[PDB]
Design a protein around this ligand. Structure first.
Ligand SMILES: [Mg+2]
Ligand SMILES: [Mg+2]
Ligand SMILES: [Mg+2]
Ligand SMILES: [Mg+2]
Ligand SMILES: [Mg+2]
Ligand SMILES: [Mg+2]
Ligand SMILES: [Mg+2]
Ligand SMILES: [Mg+2]
Ligand SMILES: [Mg+2]
Ligand SMILES: [Mg+2]
Ligand SMILES: [Mg+2]
Ligand SMILES: [Mg+2]
Ligand SMILES: [Mg+2]
Ligand SMILES: [Mg+2]
Ligand SMILES: [Mg+2]
Ligand SMILES: [Mg+2]
Ligand SMILES: [Mg+2]
Ligand SMILES: [Mg+2]
Ligand SMILES: [Mg+2]
Ligand SMILES: [Mg+2]
Ligand SMILES: [Zn+2]
Lengths: 134, 60, 121, 114, 191
RNA sequence: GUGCGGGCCGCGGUACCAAAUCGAGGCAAACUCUGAAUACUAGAUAUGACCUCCAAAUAACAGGGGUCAAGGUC
RNA sequence: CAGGUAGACAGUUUCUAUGGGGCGUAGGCCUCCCAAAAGGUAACGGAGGCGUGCAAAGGUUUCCUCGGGCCGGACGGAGAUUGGCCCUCGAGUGCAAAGGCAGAAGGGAGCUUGACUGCAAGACCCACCCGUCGAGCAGGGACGAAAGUCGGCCUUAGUGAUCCGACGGUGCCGAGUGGAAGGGCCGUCGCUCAACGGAUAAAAGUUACUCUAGGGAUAACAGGCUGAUCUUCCCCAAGAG
RNA sequence: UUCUGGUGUCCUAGGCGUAGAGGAACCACACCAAUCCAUCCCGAACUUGGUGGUUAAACUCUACUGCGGUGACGAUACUGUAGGGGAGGUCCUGCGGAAAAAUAGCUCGACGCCAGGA
């Protein structure tokens, strides 16, 4: 589970996932990538599964890069408590993802191995994605 | 009660003055610490009755 | 580190943010070099110099004669001629800018000699 | 059912009504307050004073002006204005006098009817 | 009773439990292994010592322990003079086995499982599980008192105690299932 | 990538250990080298409608007179 | 007559907010965010602080610049003290935060008490009561050669209305008159009245033996909304087999 | 009208760095002395009074775009307003307004007053 070992503040607002990323949608590292197409939240557990599913498949020298880090808390109140009485404590961490933001990068393998492994990790995500060439 | 408010009385004013100008005594009030200033606190301040600045000293 | 010329300019700006030349009380500033004195009288609102008195003037260069640098006696002459040059213009009040240098010394003699007659400062 | 738990928060001070009171190209009387601020976000310029709380106040009657006090700072000044009046031919002047005329003529018809 | 106080009072009391629960589950497992239900014995012969030139020394240092079969054991003594000393210690230890000799080595033969033994032995297995459950219930019994002691001292609320107490039972009940799980696998060993 | 100190095998050598910096690349209500649209404040400009008509009784929208409606402060 | 002394007896009090009430937590003031580019703006919303301190850490005049990194040098080492170089506001400003301040509002030195008296045009703020800035005038003064500056502190929390009382002063009144008692006036002091716009100088609990007036504005049962949770399926397939 | 020095205002803040120029005058440094004055020690600085050696350092002038500073048009994001999709997250259209960033490009200041010199 990726998360900061330190934060200036332990709690933040929900936010607002409007627009599309015009910055983190270039393939600098790696040859083939995974590009998103919908705005949604992405947790550390999801990235952990997508990494292992992508890494466990590409045995032969498959190098991986994760272009996303959560750096956002998510609070949940204690179970079966009434409203009010403050804000709940953080439980897990979330990554804000918009259409265009690249999820992963792959190198050192063929395109057939990429489409076969990239598709498996996309099955783990909560959104629709696409395969990119560069 | 380390800090305390101190009362300053004019040295030169007299009680029950029979003058025509003005009758009374000048008296200010200020802050003053005891440990940082164990001595008295005398200062040359204005006196409306004496028509000049005079040394106002601690009454107590 | 800082040199004499740099520290001099700093001492002149800290003074200038208080004194200000006006039509009613112009600004009298002094500049002493290693071999000459120099004086100006300025109305800062108009950015114009009304009067001046230098060591290089003919009416006084023939009179005084210094070998190394201008002495206290020289400053007494500069304060005298500038005063007569001010009263003819029709001004008496003035603000004294000491040019960043200390008041003690030749600067005092220039002010006193100029304050000795005519001017009010 | 289960319970709840209080917080260690809840404190906040009310708005102290800071900010600009008079803007540029607007009249300002002597002693009138232009800015109520904490620090010198704006410095004092010409024909203007400064207070204990860095409160900038005018000294004469004129219009406010904002300048830059160096590369990356700003100040305030109050220069005198002109004395140009309005012509009687303005849409505002003709309309203003129209009320005064109709108000008197309608009055004249009130007592002048019977 | 601020939230920072509830977390601290929860952290102090709870860690004393978990650190105490692990001690019980560790020692309870040792109580099962001491029953010695004739499965395999590389361990039984370890605690028996023997005399070798005026030195009490364990059997492990004097000879090797090899298990050619689950219901037997072979001892290969390097010294024939030390062979008889091994036979003395096993009998004086009163383990419940009749050692034999073939002139070179010592062979044990664990007896079979009888019906009378299985029932009397099964009573011991259940008895140890009872001693494990009461050990947990004493910890539930000790933890809830401390929450009540904080309540009487007006450092917690009635609302906080009912939440911690109800949440503390969930912790202990998890450790309870470890007691039956160790008991289930053991009851299979009786057959 | 460079690898400060050292751990590693070591009188000083080397794969592996991270105190800074470089390049590439991200995030932030309580970060900002920058920075809108609206809003706010003030000022300036401008024929609201109808009737009767100066003239012609076309046009132009052109004057005068009259009537009505409409905004705020204390 | 006075002192002490049994709820034996009497008359009464025993706050409110609250995603029902209670147990808890909180109650006033200051700073940032939420607050949506004027101002203002709620929640048991997120972060922290105040109930002071200084006789200089005030006023005035005047001279200076911190901090970091590298290098050199006995004890001395990463780091005391000292010299120099480089970047330049990254320090510091009694304390929380924001904003501001670099020849400075920061850091020293000399003299000093304006940490004044009597005022005050005109403004900001705004239910009310409060609160804030302030040119300028007289008086008598400090610093400075002078021009000029000073009506406490770089700014914003460090605080409490009224009634009553107390101390000092006073050219006021003085129950027939003269005095006096007493009172007024001016200057100031006295409440963690913190439940902080303070119901009294003075006040806690219990009721299942109970009662009245009301409320679906407000809980428990059920219905309904929601679907965290629960139940029942589907997608990917690392592996077991 | 120019050169030197002094002194300002405006300003896109006009500086760093590199390469040149300047000593007649002007500015500056260097050298010597010390009780008007000064050093929490020190004539370095500050102050008097002297010798004139030097443009070495500073400062002034001339050039540049290597850092630095400055910075678009256009397009897009965003947004007012009238509407329309999607379970929702959120998206689209018409009219009007319109960036930041980057790049091109600009930038080694502009204008006054006094004295002296030509
Ligand atoms: Mg606020
Ligand atoms: Mg009773
Ligand atoms: Mg009693
Ligand atoms: Mg009654
Ligand atoms: Mg209540
Ligand atoms: Mg707004
Ligand atoms: Mg606002
Ligand atoms: Mg609130
Ligand atoms: Mg700082
Ligand atoms: Mg200072
Ligand atoms: Mg009487
Ligand atoms: Mg008075
Ligand atoms: Mg209240
Ligand atoms: Mg009963
Ligand atoms: Mg009964
Ligand atoms: Mg209802
Ligand atoms: Mg129920
Ligand atoms: Mg219900
Ligand atoms: Mg454009
Ligand atoms: Mg730009
Ligand atoms: Zn007196």
């Amino acid at each position: 589970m990726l998360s900061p070992k330190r934060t200036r503040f332990r709690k933040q607002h929900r936010g607002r996932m409007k627009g599309i990323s015009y910055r983190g949608n270039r393939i600098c590292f790696g040859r083939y990538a995974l590009q998103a197409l919908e705005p949604a939240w992405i947790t550390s557990r999801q990235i952990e599964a997508g990494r292992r599913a992508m890494t466990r498949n590409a045995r032969r020298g498959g190098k991986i890069w994760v272009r996303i880090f959560p750096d956002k808390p998510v609070t949940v109140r204690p179970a079966e408590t009434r409203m009010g009485s403050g804000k709940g404590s953080p439980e897990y961490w979330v990554a804000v993802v918009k259409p265009g933001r690249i999820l992963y990068e792959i190198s050192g393998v063929a395109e057939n191995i990429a489409r076969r492994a990239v598709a498996i990790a996309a099955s783990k995500m909560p959104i629709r994605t696409q395969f990119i060439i560069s | 009660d380390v800090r305390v408010k101190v009362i300053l009385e004019c040295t030169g004013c007299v009680r029950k003055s029979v003058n025509k100008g003005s009758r009374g005594v000048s008296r200010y009030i200020t802050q003053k610490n005891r440990h940082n200033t164990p001595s008295r606190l005398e200062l040359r301040k204005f006196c409306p009755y004496c028509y000049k600045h005079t040394i106002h000293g601690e009454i107590k | 580190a800082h040199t004499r010329r740099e520290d001099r300019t700093a001492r002149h700006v800290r003074i200038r943010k208080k004194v200000e030349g006006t039509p009613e009380r112009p600004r009298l500033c002094v500049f002493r070099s290693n071999k000459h004195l120099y004086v100006q009288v300025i109305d800062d609102t108009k950015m114009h110099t009304l009067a001046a008195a230098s060591t290089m003037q003919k009416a006084i260069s023939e009179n005084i004669d210094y070998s190394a640098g201008p002495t206290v006696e020289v400053a007494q002459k500069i304060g005298e001629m500038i005063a007569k040059s001010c009263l003819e213009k029709g001004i008496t009040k003035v603000a004294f800018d000491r040019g960043g240098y200390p008041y003690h010394g030749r600067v005092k003699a220039l002010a006193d000699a100029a304050r000795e007659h005519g001017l009010v400062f | 059912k289960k319970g709840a738990g209080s917080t260690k928060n809840g404190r906040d001070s009310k708005g102290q009504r800071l900010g600009v009171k008079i803007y540029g190209d607007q009249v300002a009387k002597p002693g009138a307050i232009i800015i109520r601020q904490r620090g010198t976000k704006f410095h004092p310029g010409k024909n203007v004073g400064i207070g204990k709380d860095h409160t900038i106040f005018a000294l004469i009657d004129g219009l406010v002006k904002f300048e830059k006090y160096g590369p990356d700072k700003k100040k305030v000044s109050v220069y005198p204005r002109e004395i140009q009046p309005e012509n009687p031919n303005s849409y505002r002047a003709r309309k203003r006098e129209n009320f005064r005329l109709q108000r008197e003529k309608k009055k004249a018809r009130r007592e002048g009817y019977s | 009773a601020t939230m920072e106080e509830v977390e601290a009072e929860k952290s102090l009391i709870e860690t004393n439990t978990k650190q105490r629960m692990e001690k019980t589950i560790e020692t309870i497992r040792s109580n099962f292994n001491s029953v010695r239900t004739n499965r395999a014995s590389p361990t039984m012969l370890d605690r028996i010592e023997v005399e070798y030139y005026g030195t009490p020394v364990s059997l492990k240092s004097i000879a090797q322990i090899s298990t050619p079969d689950a219901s037997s054991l072979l001892i290969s003594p390097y010294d024939k003079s030390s062979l008889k000393a091994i036979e003395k210690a096993i009998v004086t230890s009163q383990l419940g086995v009749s050692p034999n000799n073939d002139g070179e080595v010592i062979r044990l033969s664990l007896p079979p499982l009888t019906s009378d033994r299985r029932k009397e032995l099964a009573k011991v297995v259940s008895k140890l599980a009872e001693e494990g459950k009461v050990a947990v219930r004493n910890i539930r019994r000790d933890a809830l008192k401390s929450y009540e002691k904080l309540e009487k001292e007006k450092k917690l609320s009635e609302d906080n105690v009912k939440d911690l107490s109800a949440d503390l039972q969930k912790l202990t009940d998890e450790y309870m299932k470890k007691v039956e799980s160790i008991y289930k696998q053991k009851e299979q060993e009786l057959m």
